[PDB]
Amino acid sequence: NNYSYIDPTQLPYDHKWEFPRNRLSFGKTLGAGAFGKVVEATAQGLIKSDAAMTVAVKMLKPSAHSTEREALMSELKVLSYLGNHENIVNLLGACTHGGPTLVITEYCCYGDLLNFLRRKRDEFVPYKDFLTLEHLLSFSYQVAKGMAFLASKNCIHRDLAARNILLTHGNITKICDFGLARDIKSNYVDKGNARLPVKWMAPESIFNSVYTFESDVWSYGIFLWELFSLGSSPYPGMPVDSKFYKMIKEGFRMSSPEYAPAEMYDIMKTCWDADPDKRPTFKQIVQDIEKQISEST
């Protein structure tokens, strides 16, 4: 075996990213969990030699175990390998010596899309600071372009959902939280023990712990249902129990949201094909949505 796939998480950390810890000033917590949090911060001298830039910083709690610390470094290495794209939350820097790992990313001033949609739900009108159908179509397109970029780098995200899409200036949407993202060299078999986002998962991920380009596409379909339902929770009135799994396996699928264009519901249904081989690729989804936007003009 003289040729092999280069595993981005095995490469050394590139100190071109290194930024002095003592030039980061922490502000409000943006998200938190059992062993970590993300905070807003000011980064003095990060980009502009004399000026401060608002960023986000991901970090573990002091009590975090070694497994969680290695997982944060692995995410930093995946982000370092991926490179830059308009529709992802980009890596800006890292702190690795003098203390625990801090990962510095772009800050998105409007927060996550799910809360944004729920806030805008009452002041939404399909046609024209109100949310409209043109905005929803734009968000669908931008998330599809970000995901096409990830797949073009042979990566899967594994937690695509409206809560992991952020909104920033100019109505630009960015995919965030690469904690579970993987380079898949043709699938990934999760051997972990964590809580899982069951209602966003492809059947083959639930039943066989298998993740692929095609299971990210399933989750994108669920994201589209969240988007055009203005932030409803998927499968309303259905607990995650034995009846849920049985229904999904037999072919049950959600109905169209009221405000989804028929051609966007069509994409949703193909993303949810029981056969992963019949689902569209993100490259095909981008081309589809592009034509819808052009015909909408």
Ligand SMILES: CCN[C@@](C)(c1ccc(F)cc1)c1cnc(N2CCN(c3ncnn4cc(-c5cnn(C)c5)cc34)CC2)nc1
């Ligand atoms: C599965 C959960 N794991 C953890 C718990 C985790 C943390 C550290 C660890 F070491 C390990 C795990 C986690 C938690 N939270 C995120 N988030 C938060 C949101 N976040 C943002 N990123 C950039 N800008 N930004 C702006 C806003 C915002 C909100 N309101 N407004 C007006 C603006 C929010 C963000 C990215 C992801 N991720 C991970």
